[PDB]
Amino acid sequence: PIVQNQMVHQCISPRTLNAWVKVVEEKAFSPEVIPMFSALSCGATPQDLNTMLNTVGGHQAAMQMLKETINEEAAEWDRLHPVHIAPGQMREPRGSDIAGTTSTLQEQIGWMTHNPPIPVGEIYKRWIILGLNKIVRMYSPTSILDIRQGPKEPFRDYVDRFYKTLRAETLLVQNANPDCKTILKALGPGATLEEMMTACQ
Amino acid sequence: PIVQNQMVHQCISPRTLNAWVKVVEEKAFSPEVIPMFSALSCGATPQDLNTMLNTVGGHQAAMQMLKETINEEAAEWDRLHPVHIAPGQMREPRGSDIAGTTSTLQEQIGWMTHNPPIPVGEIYKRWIILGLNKIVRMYSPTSILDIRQGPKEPFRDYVDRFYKTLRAETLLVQNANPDCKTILKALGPGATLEEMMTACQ
Amino acid sequence: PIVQNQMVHQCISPRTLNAWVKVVEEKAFSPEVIPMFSALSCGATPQDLNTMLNTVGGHQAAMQMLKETINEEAAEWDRLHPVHIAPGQMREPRGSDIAGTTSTLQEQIGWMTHNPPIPVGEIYKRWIILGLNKIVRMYSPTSILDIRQGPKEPFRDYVDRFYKTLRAETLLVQNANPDCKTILKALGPGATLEEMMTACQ
Amino acid sequence: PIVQNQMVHQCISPRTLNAWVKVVEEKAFSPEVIPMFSALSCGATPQDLNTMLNTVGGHQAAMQMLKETINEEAAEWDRLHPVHIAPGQMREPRGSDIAGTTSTLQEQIGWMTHNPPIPVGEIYKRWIILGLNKIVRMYSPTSILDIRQGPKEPFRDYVDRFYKTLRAETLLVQNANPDCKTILKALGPGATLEEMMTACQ
Amino acid sequence: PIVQNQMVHQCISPRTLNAWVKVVEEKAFSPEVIPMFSALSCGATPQDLNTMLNTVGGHQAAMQMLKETINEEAAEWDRLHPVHIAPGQMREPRGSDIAGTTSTLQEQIGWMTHNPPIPVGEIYKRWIILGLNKIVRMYSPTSILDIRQGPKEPFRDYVDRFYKTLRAETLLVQNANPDCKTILKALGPGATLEEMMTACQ
Amino acid sequence: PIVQNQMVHQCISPRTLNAWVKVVEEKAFSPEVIPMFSALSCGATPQDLNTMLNTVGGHQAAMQMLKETINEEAAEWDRLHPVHIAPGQMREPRGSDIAGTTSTLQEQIGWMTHNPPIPVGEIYKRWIILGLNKIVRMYSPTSILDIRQGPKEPFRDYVDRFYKTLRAETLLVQNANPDCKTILKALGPGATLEEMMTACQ
C-alpha cells in the first residue's frame, strides 16, 4: 500500500495477505466479503489489488468473470481518456495500467503520489468491486420471493433470512406466516421494523 | 482511524477488523458487545464505522433496525443544523455526511482535523450505539421478573443471572429462595450486595 | 492509554482487549488475575479502565460489587477533596470524574498530562484493585484450616494447595500428615520452606 | 528485506518466515502459491530469497529443479554481462552474485541501494518465479482436455475446475454436458462467461 | 521495560505477559524455562519482574520458596550497602527497593536511567534466577545415578536422558548397556561425544 | 539483536523466541531447521544466540555435542588471535567472549558497533551452524545408497526422498525401478532433472 511516513510505499503485510485468503475460504462470495475486501485493501496499489485477487486459489469461474468486468471498465476508461514520451516525465495511464498489468510499481507510485494525484489504486478498486458485486449477485442462492416465514419460525429468524437475501440479491408482511401477518396487518401503516419485530415476538 | 504522528489517517487494521467480526459471531448482541464495539472503534472515521457494521454477515434484521435508528438521528441532526460552496473551503456536514454515506474519506478527515474539529466520527458512533442499545434490549431473552433463585441454586449464581438480565434489559430479596430470603430479611435495611452474598453463601 | 512519543493518548489495543476478556473467562477471580489486570492496564485512562471492566460479560454479581466499592472510594475522595469554572482552565476532578463516569477523555488526558500531573488513571486503578481483592477473597472456595495433607499426598502438592489457599484468602506442620509431621518436628525450629520440602520429599 | 526509514536493510520477520513455510505445506505448488511467494518476498534481498526457498523442508525434487533453472538464468546473465577491483569501489555482480551464493549481504545492500540501483533482489526473484512456474506446470494433475462437465454437475462447479486446470497448465462449450451444451449453443456467438453461467444455472 | 527511543519506560506487552504464563503452564520448572524467563524479562524493571512472577497461578510452594531466596539476597544487599533525604535528589536503594516492594516505578526508572546507572532491574533478576535455579534443582525428578541405558534403548535416547538429568541437577560409559559399553571401552581415552554416539549408533 | 534506529540493541522478541523453540519441537534436526535458525537469528548478539540454544528443552545429547564444536572453534580462534587493559578502552575478544560466556552484553554491543566493527555475533553464528550441520548429518536416518524407487512408487515421490536424503547427508537412474530406468537410459546423456521426471511421469 501507500501510506504516510510523506506518502510512501509499504509492503503488503502477511497479516493482510492471510486475512483476505481466509475470508474467501470461509465466506465465499457472501455479501459481507466486499466491505472486508475494501478495508483490507486500504491504500492499495494496483499491484496490491492484483496480489489479493491472485492469491485466491478457488472460485476460478468467479475470478475469470471478474477479469471480464475489469477489461470492460478498462476499455471504457480508454474510450474516455485516450493517451498520447517526454524524457523524465510522467506518462498518462491507460486502462491496463490502472489494472496493473502493463504498469510498473514505480509508475503506480508516481501516479498515486503526484500533485495532483492520479488515484489509480482507487480507480482500479472501484472496477474490482463492480465485478465482485456481480458475482455476489450471481451466487446468491435464493430469490426474495422464496423467503417466507415458517409455521413455527420465530419472526426474528425470518427477518434475518429476508434481509440477508435482499442484501445478496409490504413483501415482509405478505411473506410472514398467518399468525404474525394478522398481528402486523393490525399494526396499521407506517410501522418501523423494530415495531413489527416486537409485535410478532 | 485518525491518530497522532499531527493527527493523520491510518488504515483500519486486520486485527481490528477480525476482532469485531468475531465478537459478533461469538457474543451476538449480549450487552458487553457494546463496550467492545466502542473500544475497537477508537478514533474511527464514519467510513471505519460503516466498515465495521458492514463486515457483519449475520443478524441482518438487527442491522436493518440499526440503519433505521441511524436515519432517525441523521434527520434530527438536519433539523437542528441545516446546511447551505466557496472554492477550496470546508462545507458543513449533513446527517448522511456524518453517517458516511454521502461524504468522502477526505471530507471526513477534513472535518475531524479542522480547528475547531467537527468530530463526525464521534457523532456517528453515538448514533450507532443508540441503535445498538435498542437491539441489545430487544434481544434480551428474559424479564427481570422471571429471574428467581432456584431451590438449590447457589445465591451467587442467582445474583449473576439477575444482574446479567438487568444489564440486557428489594426485587433481589423478593426473588431469592425461602431459605436465603429469611436470612436476607433478618439482615435489616441498608445491606450491601457483598453483605447479602456473604450471608447466603 | 497514555504513553510517550511527549505523553500522548493511544487507543487501547485489540490485543489488550482480548487478553483481559480471556483471562477472566479462563481464570475467573483466582488471585493471579489481579496482577494481570494491573499489567494489562499499564498507562490506562479511567475510560480505558471502564472499557476493560465493561467488556466482561459474565460475573455480573462481582461487577456490581465492584461498582459498590468504587462508589465508596469516590465518596471518600469527595470528602477529602471538595471541588469548587475559569474560562480555558482545568477543573478539579471529583470522585465520579476519576471513575470516568462524569469526565471526558480530553479532561482525563488533561489531568494525566498536566504539570504537576493528576494521575486519575492510577487513582482509579487503586480503587478497582481494592474492589477486585474483595471479590477474590469472597470467591476463595476453601479455608486454610481445611487444607490438610492427604495420607499419600506428596508434600509438594499439599504445600501448593496451602499457599494457593492462603493467597486467595506452624499451621503448615500441624496440617501435614503424620509421617511428614514427624519428620518436620524433628527438623527443629527455624527451618526454611525449602528445607521442609526436601525433608518430606 | 530493504525498506525505507532512506532505504535500509530490515531482518526478515518470523511472521513472513512462517507464512511462506505454511503456504507450501498447505498448498504445495498450486498456482496461487506463486503470487503469495512474490508478495511475501516484497523488498527481499537475494539472501532473503534463499532463506525462503531453503526453509522449505519437503518437495526436494522441485527444489532441485528450481536450482537448475536458476543456474540456467545465471549463465545467461553471465553471457550478457561479463564482469571484469578498485579499492573501495562497487564490483559488478555475476549470476551467482545475483543468486546470492557468492555475494555477501553487504554487497547485495550496496547494489540494491546504489544510484543508479542494481535491483539484484528483483532480478533473482524473476528467475525464481520462472523456475516455480515450470514446477506448477509439472505438478498440474490434469489436462484441460479431461475436464468435462458431469451429468449432474452444476455448471459453476465445472467452470471452476476448467479454469483451475487452465491456470495450472469453445472448449468450454464442447466439454459441457448435453443439456447445458444445447442451451449454450442457442446463446449464439459472443456470449460472456457471466451469460453462459446464468444460462446453465 | 526500559528501552531506547533516550532510555524510556515501555509498558510490558500482552505478548510478553502471555508467553511467560504459558511457558510455566506448559514446562513447569524444567531447566529451559530459566533462559526463557531471562529473555522475556529483557530490560525489565523490578515492577515488571514482580508482574511476571505474580501472574503465575500455580506452583505456589515454589513461588513462596522464591520469595524466601529473594529476601535472603535483599538482606545481604542491605548488609553490604546500608542506606542513609535531600529535596529533589535520588535516594539510595535498599534490598526491598531492588525487589520492587518498597520502591515506586518512577524511582526504579530514576535508578535505571541515572548516570551512572544503578541497574536495579538486573540486580533483582539475578536474585530471581538464583531462586529459580534452586527450584529447578528441587523439582528434578531423577538422580544422574539412576539414568542407565536400557537393553534395547538407542544410545542417542539414553544420552538425551543423561544430559537432560545433568542439566536439571566416565559415568556415561559406566551407565551404558553391555553391548555399547564394550564398544565405548574399545574406543580408548579421549573420545568426543560425537565419536561415542557414532560408535554406538 | 542489533538493528538500526544508528545501530542499537533491541530485545529479542517473544515471537522470535517461540518460533525457534517450536521449529525444534516440530522438525528436530531436519536440514531445513538450519536456514530457519540463521534467519531467526538475524542481527543476533552472542547473548541472543545462547538464548536461542538454551531455550531448547529436548535433544540434550545434540546440545552437548554443539557445545563441544563451539569450544573447538573458540580454541582455534584463540590460537589465531591471542589477546593481551587501558582505562576506558575496548579489549580484544577471546573465543569464550565470542561465544558469549565470558563477555557482557555491553561488551558485545561495543564490539558489534565499533568502527571498524568486530562482528562477534556473526562469528559465533558461523561456529554454531558448523556444529548444527554435524548434528543434522548425524541424525540423518538413511543412506543415499538405500534410497531406491519402489515397484509402484511414483518417480516424483522417489526423487523427493532421494534429494531429501542427499540434503541431510547416475545414482538417481541406477536406483530407479526397472520400468523408469529403461525410459531414463533411453533419454541419453545430459538430461536435466525436469526431463527425467517428465519422462517417468
Q: Annotate E50-100 with DSSP letters as a single string.
A: HHHHHT--S-HHHHHHHHHHHHHHHHHHHHHS-----TTPPPPP-HHHHTT
How far apart are the C-alpha atoms of F122 and F45, rounded to whole Å?
8
In sequence order, what are the residues at sequence separation of 6 or more whose Cβ sits closer than 8 angstroms to the Cβ of residue C42? Answer: C1, E11, E12
* Cβ atoms F17, E40 nearer than 8 A: yes
How far apart are the C-alpha atoms of C53 and C74, rounded to whole Å?
17
Experimental method: X-ray
* Cβ atoms B105, B112 nearer than 8 A: no
How far apart are the C-alpha atoms of C101 and C84, rounded to whole Å?
19
Angle, CA A127 vertex, CA A31 and CA B90 arms, to 5°: 95
Count Cβ atoms within 10 A of the Cβ of residue E164 and give its class: 0-12 exposed, 13-18 middle, 19 or more buried: buried
How far apart are the C-alpha atoms of A74 and A130, rounded to whole Å?
12
Integer angstrom CA distances of residue B176 from A121, B144, B149, B157, D52: 63, 12, 5, 11, 65
Of C19, C27, C197, the CB nearest to E18: C19
Interface of D with F in 136-175 (CB under 8 A): 138-139
User: Considering only CB atoms, which chain B residues are within 8 Å of C11?
Assistant: 1, 3, 39, 42-43
* Cβ atoms D37, A17 nearer than 8 A: no
Contacts by F170-175 with C-beta closer than 8 Å and gap 24+?
F171/F144, F172/F196, F175/F147, F175/F148, F175/F149
State whether residue A129 sits within 8 Å of chain B by CB: no
Do A and C count as touching (3 or more CB pairs closer than 8 A)?
no
User: Considering only CB atoms, which chain F residues are within 8 Å of D60?
Assistant: 159-160, 162-164, 166-167
Q: How many distinct helices (H) and strands (E) make up chain F?
A: 11, 2
* Cβ atoms A2, A45 nearer than 8 A: yes
Q: What is the four-CA torsion angle of E134, E138, E139, E140, rounded to 10 degrees?
A: 100
In sequence order, what are the residues at sequence separation of 6 or more whose Cβ sits closer than 8 angstroms to the Cβ of residue F79? Answer: none
Q: Computed from CA positions of residues F155, F160, F161, F163, in that sequence, does the dihedral angle turn out positive or negative?
A: positive
Cell 555399547 appears where? E180
User: Considering only CB atoms, which chain B residues are within 8 Å of A42?
Assistant: 11-12
* Cβ atoms B124, B46 nearer than 8 A: yes
* Cβ atoms A78, A95 nearer than 8 A: yes
How far apart are the C-alpha atoms of F176 and C70, rounded to whole Å?
79
**For the stretch F57-70, what's the b/e string if a residue is b when 16 or more beta carbons lie within 10 angstroms of its beta carbon?**
bebbbbbbbbbebb
Contacts by E195-201 with C-beta closer than 8 Å and gap 24+?
E196/E155, E196/E172, E197/E155, E197/E156, E197/E159, E197/F61, E197/F65, E197/F138, E198/F138, E200/E155, E200/E176, E201/E155, E201/E156, E201/F138
Q: Is residue A4 helix, strand or coil? A: strand
Count Cβ atoms within 10 A of the Cβ of residue A146 and give its class: 0-12 exposed, 13-18 middle, 19 or more buried: exposed
User: Considering only CB atoms, which chain A residues are within 8 Å of D19?
Assistant: 14, 17-18
How far apart are the C-alpha atoms of D74 and E3, rounded to whole Å?
45
Q: Is residue D95 helix, strand or coil? A: helix
Q: Nearest chain F Cα to E13, which residue? A: F14
Given this structure, which CATH class describes domain A144-201? Answer: mainly alpha
Tally of CB atoms within 10 A around A170? 5
In sequence order, what are the residues at sequence separation of 6 or more whose Cβ sits closer than 8 angstroms to the Cβ of residue B114? Answer: B90
DSSP H or E stretch at residue D60? helix D60-80
Q: Is residue E118 helix, strand or coil? A: coil
Pull the grid cell for residue B181. Answer: 430470603
What residues pair up with C9 in beta bridges, in sequence order? C2
Nearest C-alpha of chain B: how many angstroms from A193? 6
Of C10, C12, C61, the CB nearest to B39: C12
- Check CB contact under 8 Å for A13 and B14: yes
Q: Which of F5, F20, F55 to mutate to test the interface with E (most CBs of E within 10 A)?
A: F55
Sequence ranges of chain A with CATH classification 1.10.1200.30: 144-201
State whether residue E79 sits within 8 Å of chain C by CB: no
- Check CB contact under 8 Å for B159 and C61: yes
Q: Nearest chain F Cα to D15, which residue? A: F15
Of E8, E14, E139, the CB nearest to C4: E8
User: Considering only CB atoms, which chain D residues are within 8 Å of A14?
Assistant: 13, 15-16, 19, 40
Contacts by D47-50 with C-beta closer than 8 Å and gap 24+?
D47/D100, D47/D105, D47/D108, D48/D1, D48/D12, D48/D121, D49/D100, D49/D121, D49/D124, D49/D125, D49/D128, D50/D99, D50/D100, D50/D101, D50/F35
Half-sphere exposure for B97 (CA within 13 Å, toward CB): 22
Integer angstrom CA distances of residue A94 from A53, A120, A125, B184: 20, 10, 15, 80
User: Could you tell me how far CA D131 lies from the centroid of its own chain?
Assistant: 8
Q: Is residue F91 helix, strand or coil? A: coil
* Helix, strand, coil tally for chain A in percent (to 5): 60, 5, 35
How far apart are the C-alpha atoms of C59 and C66, rounded to whole Å?
11
Q: Is residue D94 helix, strand or coil? A: coil
Contacts by F93-102 with C-beta closer than 8 Å and gap 24+?
F93/F118, F93/F120, F95/F71, F97/F46, F98/F46, F98/F74, F98/F123, F98/F124, F98/F127, F99/F46, F99/F50, F99/F70, F99/F71, F99/F74, F99/F124, F99/F127, F100/F45, F100/F46, F100/F47, F100/F49, F100/F50, F100/F124, F101/F50
Pull the grid cell for residue B119. Answer: 468530530
Residue type, A93: P
* Cβ atoms E100, E157 nearer than 8 A: no
Pull the grid cell for residue D61. Answer: 525434487
Of B30, B38, B198, the CB nearest to C138: B198
Chain breaks in chain A (C to N over 2.5 A) after: 5, 84, 169
User: Could you tell me how far CA E55 lies from the centroid of its own chain?
Assistant: 17
User: Considering only CB atoms, which chain F residues are within 8 Å of E42?
Assistant: 11-12
Q: Nearest chain B Cα to C11, which residue? A: B42
How far apart are the C-alpha atoms of C164 and C142, rounded to whole Å?
10
How far apart are the C-alpha atoms of C172 and D15, rounded to whole Å?
49
CATH topology of domain A1-143: Human Immunodeficiency Virus Type 1 Capsid Protein (1.10.375)
Q: What is the four-CA torsion angle of B157, B160, B161, B164, rounded to 10 degrees?
A: -170
Chain breaks in chain D (C to N over 2.5 A) after: 5, 84, 169
Q: Is residue F4 helix, strand or coil? A: strand
How far apart are the C-alpha atoms of A124 and E189, rounded to whole Å?
75
Q: Which of C102, C121, C125, C101 is nearest to C111 (CA)?
A: C121
How far apart are the C-alpha atoms of B183 and B181, rounded to whole Å?
5
How far apart are the C-alpha atoms of B167 and B151, rounded to whole Å?
24
How far apart are the C-alpha atoms of C149 and F157, rounded to whole Å?
60
User: Considering only CB atoms, which chain F residues are within 8 Å of E162?
Assistant: 60-61
Integer angstrom CA distances of residue A164 from A15, A144, B61, C77, F1: 29, 9, 8, 52, 52
How many residues belong to chain F? 201
Sequence ranges of chain D with CATH classification 1.10.375.10: 1-143
State whether residue E191 sits within 8 Å of chain C by CB: no
State whether residue A133 sits within 8 Å of chain B by CB: no
